[PDB]
Amino acid sequence: KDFEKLYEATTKLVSTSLKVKDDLKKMFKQNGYDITTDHYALLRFLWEQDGISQIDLCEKSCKDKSNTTRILDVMKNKGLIVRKVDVKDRRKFQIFLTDLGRELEEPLNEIASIYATETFKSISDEELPLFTDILDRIG
Amino acid sequence: PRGSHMKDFEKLYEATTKLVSTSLKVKDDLKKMFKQNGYDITTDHYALLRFLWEQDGISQIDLCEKSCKDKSNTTRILDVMKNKGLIVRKVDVKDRRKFQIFLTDLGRELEEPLNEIASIYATETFKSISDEELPLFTDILDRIG
Numbered sequence: 001k002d003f004e005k006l007y008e009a010t011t012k013l014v015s016t017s018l019k020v021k022d023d024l025k026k027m028f029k030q031n032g033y034d035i036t037t038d039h040y041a042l043l044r045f046l047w048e049q050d051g052i053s054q055i056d057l058c059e060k061s062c063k064d065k066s067n068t069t070r071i072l073d074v075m076k077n078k079g080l081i082v083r084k085v086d087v088k089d090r091r092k093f094q095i096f097l098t099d100l101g102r103e104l105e106e107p108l109n110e111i112a113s114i115y116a117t118e119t120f121k122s123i124s125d126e127e128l129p130l131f132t133d134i135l136d137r138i139g
Numbered sequence: 140p141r142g143s144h145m146k147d148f149e150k151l152y153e154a155t156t157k158l159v160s161t162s163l164k165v166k167d168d169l170k171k172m173f174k175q176n177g178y179d180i181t182t183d184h185y186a187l188l189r190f191l192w193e194q195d196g197i198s199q200i201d202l203c204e205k206s207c208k209d210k211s212n213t214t215r216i217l218d219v220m221k222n223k224g225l226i227v228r229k230v231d232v233k234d235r236r237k238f239q240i241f242l243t244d245l246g247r248e249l250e251e252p253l254n255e256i257a258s259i260y261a262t263e264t265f266k267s268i269s270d271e272e273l274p275l276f277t278d279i280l281d282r283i284g
């Protein structure tokens with residue numbers, strides 16, 4: 001409708017995504033926090049709700065089970081989260097924030113806010129839900 | 140940074156999240172479709188091949204400007220393409236130390252079957268999206284950043 005246009009949209013979608021992820025990461029680094037966008041998204045779920053099951057974070061995350069688990073080990077190794085074997089299943093892992101994990105909410109949210117305002121500055125508030133809804137119908 | 144009409148951070152974050160997820164789903168599904176139909180090609184590969192079908196023998200340098208993925212990642216990906224037999228690296232006759240990138244016979248032949256799959260894929264993927272909506276979507280993506 002027509003392929004050339006469709007391919008161009010797909011490309012822009014995919015550049016933009018990468019640029020977004022990559023600039024937010026840089027901004028966390030510049031302020032001295034060595035974290036990725038993936039780590040931030042995961043931590044956001046936990047700040048809402050601590051003790052999420054790993055499978056539960058599969059679902060919410062996306063990824064494969066391989067990738068998510070590797071991202072979570074990187075996070076544990078930076079001290080943000082710990083991993084417990086569950087009180088309603090040996091099979092399941094529950095995921096808890098450390099103190100470090102809790103502490104970073106204010107500041108990581110602050111940097112993400114600053115990134116967001118600048119990044120979305122040319123776009124109107126009323127364009128968001130259109131954008132969002134077009135993304136939701138893609139696929 | 141500020142003004143008199145700020146957006147809600149939550150909304151911006153949700154949009155960023157949806158943008159990211161959707162990018163990933165689209166990439167990953169296109170890759171699955173290529174493999175299911177017998178071609179072991181990533182979306183990154185296919186995207187580079189598109190640039191080569193338009194402009195065979197382009198410089199590594201000019202490929203990176205178009206590519207994004209600024210240098211070491213386009214390169215690593217180019218290497219993987221050479222070892223797949225899709226492309227070939229040729230020292231520039233003019234301008235020392237530049238390379239030009241050329242399609243193999245295999246890389247040329249893939250143009251038709253790979254565009255066929257991607258095209259079908261794109262139409263499915265965008266079927267719920269009206270003709271008026273598309274450049275709107277595209278224009279928002281251009282203003283992001």
Ligand SMILES: [Hg+2]
Pocket residue numbers: 014015183186206207
């Ligand atoms: Hg790309």
Ligand SMILES: [Hg+2]
Pocket residue numbers: 038041061062156159160
């Ligand atoms: Hg994500």
Ligand SMILES: [Hg+2]
Pocket residue numbers: 058059062063064065068
């Ligand atoms: Hg999963």
Ligand SMILES: [Hg+2]
Pocket residue numbers: 199200203209210211213214
């Ligand atoms: Hg390169």
